[PDB]
C-alpha cells in the first residue's frame, strides 16, 4: 500500500463526500439504525481530521505507519466500491431486499468495523497500535509470541501462526475463519480484529472448537447481519415463539447479540452479560426462549 500523504487523504474525503451525497436520496429510505453510513463516514472524516492534526509537522512519520497505510488503502477501496454499487445497481438500489441493497448494508457494517478499528488503534488521534491491550490473557500471549508489538499482519502470516497452535482442519475451514475474523475485509488481521475474535470465541484453549460449534455448524449464527436485518429475518417466525438467531453486535464489538421471538409476539434483541454465549444459549434453550435456530425445529446440543 502506498505512502499516505495529505493529497491521498484529500482524495479519500472527496470519495466519502460522494457516498454521503448518494445516501441522502429519499428513495433509499435508509434507516438511522447502526450501522448508519450517514453517521459513519462523517465520523471517520472527523477522526481522520483529528489524526492529521495530531501529526502536524510529522506527516512523514504518519505516512509511513504500516497500519495507517493499509487502513487508508482499504477505506479508498471500500468507498469506490460503494460508489460503483450505486452506479451499477441503479433503480435496484431503491428496492428493499434487492441484492444491491443487501450489499450496501454489508458495506455499512464494514465501514462501522473500520471506524471502530481506527479508533482502537488511534485513540485520541495518536498511533497506539503497538501498545494495544489484548483482552484475553492467553490470546495476548499468542499474539506477542508470534508478532511481538505488531499491529497488523497479512492474513497468510496469521493463518500460518495460528495453525501452529490451533490446527485448521481444511482449506474451506480456513476460508470460513478468514470470513469471520477479517471484519474490515482487507486480507489483513489487525490486533484489534484478533481481540474481537478471541473475545467472541473464548476460551482460547478450545478456540476453533468453540467457533466451529457456535458459527461454522450452527444454524442460528448470522454473519455480517445488522440489528434491523435480524428483526426482518425473524418476522416470518412471529407466530413461532422460541425462534432465535445471533450475531456480532455492531456497536459493542466483541460481544454477542441474540434476537428472539417471544410468546407475546415481540422480537427482542439482547446482549448477554456475565455469561459466555455457550451458557446463554444452553440456559435459553432450557428455559424455553432459544428453541428454534433460524426457525428450525431442531436445535444444536451445545452441552
Amino acid at each position: 500500500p502506498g505512502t499516505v500523504d495529505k493529497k491521498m487523504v484529500e482524495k479519500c474525503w472527496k470519495l466519502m463526500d460522494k457516498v454521503v451525497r448518494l445516501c441522502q436520496n429519499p428513495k433509499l429510505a435508509l434507516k438511522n439504525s447502526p450501522p448508519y453510513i450517514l453517521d459513519l463516514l462523517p465520523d471517520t472524516y472527523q477522526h481522520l481530521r483529528t489524526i492529521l492534526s495530531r501529526y502536524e509537522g510529522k506527516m512523514e512519520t504518519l505516512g509511513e505507519n504500516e497500519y495507517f497505510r493499509v487502513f487508508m488503502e482499504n477505506l479508498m477501496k471500500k468507498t469506490k466500491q460503494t460508489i460503483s454499487l450505486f452506479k451499477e445497481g441503479k433503480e435496484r438500489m431503491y428496492e428493499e431486499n434487492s441484492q444491491p441493497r443487501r450489499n450496501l448494508t454489508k458495506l455499512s457494517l464494514i465501514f462501522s468495523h473500520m471506524l471502530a478499528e481506527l479508533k482502537g488503534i488511534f485513540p485520541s488521534g495518536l498511533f497506539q497500535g503497538d501498545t494495544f491491550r489484548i483482552t484475553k490473557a492467553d490470546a495476548a500471549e499468542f499474539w506477542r509470541k508470534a508478532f511481538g508489538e505488531k499491529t497488523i499482519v497479512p492474513w497468510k502470516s496469521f493463518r500460518q501462526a495460528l495453525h501452529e497452535v490451533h490446527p485448521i482442519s481444511s482449506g474451506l475451514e480456513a476460508m470460513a475463519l478468514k470470513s469471520t475474523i477479517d471484519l474490515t475485509c482487507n486480507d489483513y488481521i489487525s490486533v484489534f480484529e484478533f481481540d474481537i475474535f478471541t473475545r467472541l470465541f473464548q476460551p482460547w484453549s478450545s478456540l476453533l472448537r468453540n467457533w466451529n460449534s457456535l458459527a461454522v455448524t450452527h444454524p442460528g449464527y448470522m454473519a455480517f447481519l445488522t440489528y434491523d436485518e435480524v428483526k426482518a429475518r425473524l418476522q416470518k417466525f412471529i407466530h413461532k415463539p422460541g425462534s432465535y438467531i445471533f450475531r456480532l453486535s455492531c456497536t459493542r464489538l466483541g460481544q454477542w447479540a441474540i434476537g428472539y421471538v417471544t410468546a407475546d409476539g415481540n422480537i427482542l434483541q439482547t446482549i448477554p452479560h456475565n455469561k459466555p454465549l455457550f451458557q446463554a444459549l444452553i440456559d435459553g434453550f432450557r428455559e424455553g426462549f432459544y428453541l428454534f435456530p433460524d426457525g428450525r425445529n431442531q436445535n444444536p446440543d451445545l452441552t
Partner: peptide, 22 residues
C-alpha cells in the same frame, strides 16, 4: 438541500437491546 461530509454531525441513534430472558 444535500449535506456535505463536513456539515453532517452524527445522530448516534442506538438500537434497543433489552435485558436477557434468563
Amino acid at each position: 438541500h444535500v449535506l456535505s461530509l463536513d456539515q453532517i454531525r452524527a445522530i448516534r441513534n442506538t438500537n434497543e437491546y433489552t435485558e436477557g430472558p434468563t
